Design a protein around this motif. Sequence first.
Motif, PDB file in Angstrom:
ATOM      1  N   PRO A 175       0.782  -1.052   0.229  1.00 23.76           N
ATOM      2  CA  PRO A 175      -0.543   0.179  -0.442  1.00 23.76           C
ATOM      3  C   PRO A 175       0.761   1.279  -0.003  1.00 23.76           C
ATOM      4  O   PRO A 175       1.118   1.950   1.179  1.00 23.76           O
ATOM      5  N   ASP A 176       1.480   2.227  -0.905  1.00 23.71           N
ATOM      6  CA  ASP A 176       1.894   3.144  -1.850  1.00 23.71           C
ATOM      7  C   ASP A 176       1.450   3.633  -2.570  1.00 23.71           C
ATOM      8  O   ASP A 176       0.765   3.077  -3.451  1.00 23.71           O
ATOM      9  N   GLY A 177       1.743   5.225  -2.734  1.00 23.19           N
ATOM     10  CA  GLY A 177       1.680   5.837  -4.045  1.00 23.19           C
ATOM     11  C   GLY A 177       0.783   7.076  -3.122  1.00 23.19           C
ATOM     12  O   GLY A 177       0.172   7.581  -2.028  1.00 23.19           O
ATOM     13  N   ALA A 178      -0.780   7.084  -4.036  1.00 25.74           N
ATOM     14  CA  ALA A 178      -1.106   8.819  -4.124  1.00 25.74           C
ATOM     15  C   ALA A 178      -2.953   8.447  -3.564  1.00 25.74           C
ATOM     16  O   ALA A 178      -3.706   8.512  -3.112  1.00 25.74           O
ATOM     17  N   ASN A 179      -3.276   6.941  -3.939  1.00 30.92           N
ATOM     18  CA  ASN A 179      -4.406   5.634  -3.691  1.00 30.92           C
ATOM     19  C   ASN A 179      -4.235   5.296  -2.886  1.00 30.92           C
ATOM     20  O   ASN A 179      -5.367   3.843  -2.803  1.00 30.92           O
ATOM     21  N   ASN A 180      -3.781   5.384  -1.299  1.00 31.23           N
ATOM     22  CA  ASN A 180      -3.890   4.386  -0.401  1.00 31.23           C
ATOM     23  C   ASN A 180      -4.294   5.360   1.146  1.00 31.23           C
ATOM     24  O   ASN A 180      -4.380   4.897   2.094  1.00 31.23           O
ATOM     25  N   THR A 181      -5.639   6.130   1.083  1.00 30.86           N
ATOM     26  CA  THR A 181      -5.968   6.861   1.335  1.00 30.86           C
ATOM     27  C   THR A 181      -7.415   5.685   2.650  1.00 30.86           C
ATOM     28  O   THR A 181      -7.427   7.002   3.690  1.00 30.86           O
ATOM     29  N   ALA A 182      -7.176   4.699   2.141  1.00 30.02           N
ATOM     30  CA  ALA A 182      -8.388   4.803   2.461  1.00 30.02           C
ATOM     31  C   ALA A 182      -8.473   3.613   4.439  1.00 30.02           C
ATOM     32  O   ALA A 182      -7.470   3.375   4.076  1.00 30.02           O
ATOM     33  N   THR A 183      -9.162   3.903   4.713  1.00 28.84           N
ATOM     34  CA  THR A 183      -8.813   3.880   6.392  1.00 28.84           C
ATOM     35  C   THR A 183     -10.175   2.846   6.859  1.00 28.84           C
ATOM     36  O   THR A 183      -9.812   1.771   7.645  1.00 28.84           O
ATOM     37  N   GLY A 184     -10.831   2.588   5.959  1.00 31.20           N
ATOM     38  CA  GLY A 184     -12.155   1.057   6.146  1.00 31.20           C
ATOM     39  C   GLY A 184     -12.916   1.020   7.486  1.00 31.20           C
ATOM     40  O   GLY A 184     -13.235   2.264   7.529  1.00 31.20           O
ATOM     41  N   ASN A 185     -13.016   0.451   8.166  1.00 32.20           N
ATOM     42  CA  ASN A 185     -13.626   0.480   9.538  1.00 32.20           C
ATOM     43  C   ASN A 185     -13.401   1.853  10.390  1.00 32.20           C
ATOM     44  O   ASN A 185     -13.944   2.184   9.968  1.00 32.20           O
ATOM     45  N   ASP A 186     -12.022   1.445  10.509  1.00 26.67           N
ATOM     46  CA  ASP A 186     -12.047   2.393  11.314  1.00 26.67           C
ATOM     47  C   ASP A 186     -11.371   3.748  11.279  1.00 26.67           C
ATOM     48  O   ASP A 186     -11.127   3.595   9.580  1.00 26.67           O
ATOM     49  N   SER A 187     -10.826   4.679  11.132  1.00 23.33           N
ATOM     50  CA  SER A 187      -9.904   5.900  10.817  1.00 23.33           C
ATOM     51  C   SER A 187      -7.640   5.387  10.870  1.00 23.33           C
ATOM     52  O   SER A 187      -7.585   6.429  10.652  1.00 23.33           O
ATOM     53  N   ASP A 188      -7.573   3.807  10.276  1.00 17.76           N
ATOM     54  CA  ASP A 188      -6.527   4.378  10.185  1.00 17.76           C
ATOM     55  C   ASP A 188      -6.808   3.178   8.259  1.00 17.76           C
ATOM     56  O   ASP A 188      -6.928   2.622   8.902  1.00 17.76           O
ATOM     57  N   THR A 189      -5.541   3.406   7.707  1.00 20.99           N
ATOM     58  CA  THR A 189      -5.023   3.147   6.560  1.00 20.99           C
ATOM     59  C   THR A 189      -4.585   2.165   6.312  1.00 20.99           C
ATOM     60  O   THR A 189      -3.520   1.741   7.409  1.00 20.99           O
ATOM     61  N   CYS A 190      -4.825   0.998   5.447  1.00 24.05           N
ATOM     62  CA  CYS A 190      -4.277  -0.097   5.864  1.00 24.05           C
ATOM     63  C   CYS A 190      -2.338  -0.700   5.733  1.00 24.05           C
ATOM     64  O   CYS A 190      -2.252  -1.675   6.176  1.00 24.05           O
ATOM     65  N   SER A 191      -2.031   0.494   5.022  1.00 28.89           N
ATOM     66  CA  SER A 191      -0.544   0.956   5.281  1.00 28.89           C
ATOM     67  C   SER A 191       0.175   0.990   6.863  1.00 28.89           C
ATOM     68  O   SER A 191       0.797  -0.249   7.059  1.00 28.89           O
ATOM     69  N   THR A 192      -0.720   1.752   7.769  1.00 29.92           N
ATOM     70  CA  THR A 192       0.046   1.921   9.465  1.00 29.92           C
ATOM     71  C   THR A 192      -0.639   1.109   9.746  1.00 29.92           C
ATOM     72  O   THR A 192      -0.322   0.147  11.200  1.00 29.92           O
ATOM     73  N   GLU A 193      -2.152   0.270   9.193  1.00 32.78           N
ATOM     74  CA  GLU A 193      -2.571  -0.970   9.592  1.00 32.78           C
ATOM     75  C   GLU A 193      -1.077  -2.104   9.997  1.00 32.78           C
ATOM     76  O   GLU A 193      -1.831  -3.281  11.237  1.00 32.78           O
ATOM     77  N   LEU A 194      -0.867  -2.183   8.877  1.00 35.01           N
ATOM     78  CA  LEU A 194       0.370  -3.629   9.053  1.00 35.01           C
ATOM     79  C   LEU A 194       1.537  -3.600   9.769  1.00 35.01           C
ATOM     80  O   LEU A 194       1.663  -4.335  10.129  1.00 35.01           O
ATOM     81  N   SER A 195       1.888  -1.841   9.551  1.00 32.93           N
ATOM     82  CA  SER A 195       3.139  -1.722  10.565  1.00 32.93           C
ATOM     83  C   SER A 195       2.792  -2.494  11.893  1.00 32.93           C
ATOM     84  O   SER A 195       3.619  -2.307  12.486  1.00 32.93           O
ATOM     85  N   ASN A 196       1.970  -2.096  12.090  1.00 36.66           N
ATOM     86  CA  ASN A 196       1.220  -2.308  14.269  1.00 36.66           C
ATOM     87  C   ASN A 196       0.916  -3.243  13.867  1.00 36.66           C
ATOM     88  O   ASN A 196       2.040  -3.963  15.641  1.00 36.66           O
ATOM     89  N   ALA A 197       1.494  -4.860  12.893  1.00 44.95           N
ATOM     90  CA  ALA A 197       1.051  -5.732  13.457  1.00 44.95           C
ATOM     91  C   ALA A 197       2.744  -6.859  13.073  1.00 44.95           C
ATOM     92  O   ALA A 197       3.069  -7.352  12.788  1.00 44.95           O
ATOM     93  N   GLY A 198       3.803  -5.546  12.739  1.00 46.91           N
ATOM     94  CA  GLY A 198       5.155  -6.046  13.143  1.00 46.91           C
ATOM     95  C   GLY A 198       5.574  -5.637  11.123  1.00 46.91           C
ATOM     96  O   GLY A 198       6.908  -6.893  11.203  1.00 46.91           O
ATOM     97  N   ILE A 199       4.775  -6.285  10.439  1.00 45.51           N
ATOM     98  CA  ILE A 199       4.768  -6.759   9.000  1.00 45.51           C
ATOM     99  C   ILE A 199       5.764  -5.640   8.286  1.00 45.51           C
ATOM    100  O   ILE A 199       4.754  -4.719   8.261  1.00 45.51           O
ATOM    101  N   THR A 200       7.189  -6.474   7.643  1.00 47.27           N
ATOM    102  CA  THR A 200       7.451  -5.469   6.725  1.00 47.27           C
ATOM    103  C   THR A 200       7.791  -6.261   5.610  1.00 47.27           C
ATOM    104  O   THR A 200       7.777  -5.883   3.907  1.00 47.27           O
ATOM    105  N   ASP A 201       7.028  -7.170   4.921  1.00 48.63           N
ATOM    106  CA  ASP A 201       6.551  -7.950   4.083  1.00 48.63           C
ATOM    107  C   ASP A 201       5.370  -7.718   3.684  1.00 48.63           C
ATOM    108  O   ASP A 201       4.796  -7.748   3.501  1.00 48.63           O
ATOM    109  N   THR A 202       5.245  -5.752   2.918  1.00 48.56           N
ATOM    110  CA  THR A 202       4.207  -5.335   2.170  1.00 48.56           C
ATOM    111  C   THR A 202       3.760  -6.349   1.310  1.00 48.56           C
ATOM    112  O   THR A 202       2.400  -6.776   1.370  1.00 48.56           O
TER     113      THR A 202
END
Lengths: 72, 73
Positions: free
Chosen positions: B38-65
């Motif tokens: 999830p990188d670029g200009a079209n990664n701003t969707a937050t889904g159910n909560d107010s957290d974007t998918c890119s930071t959502e992955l980072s909180n889980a310690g995942i580097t294999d994005t």
Amino acid sequence: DLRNGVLQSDKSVYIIGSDMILTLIEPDFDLDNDSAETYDLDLIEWDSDAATTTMGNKGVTGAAAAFDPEPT
Amino acid sequence: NSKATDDAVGSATTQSLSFGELGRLLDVTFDDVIWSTPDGANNTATGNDSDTCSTELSNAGITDTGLGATGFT
């Protein structure tokens, strides 16, 4: 000479998401014997209760990805 | 992020042709969908909560994005 085409499939009934083999017998199209000729997939029509589409790049939005042709 | 051959094995240089995209040689998919970061200009969707998918992955310690981030060659 020109001849009329025969269109057929491997079997009548298919499970949703399974792969079907689609065969077209048009002798009109063997222009070169030495090479294998390639023809656009928009020639075929898909019409059903769901939608009516050409199963190619000219179909309804997202129809091309919905069939996943191999080859293109 | 400006080319159709993103997160796939091939070349950034590319063209749009009948058979598909000329700069694409191999790619990997989960559920018939390209595995991409999830990188670029079209990664701003937050889904159910107010957290974007890119930071959502980072909180889980995942580097294999995506495939490009594993260093696959």
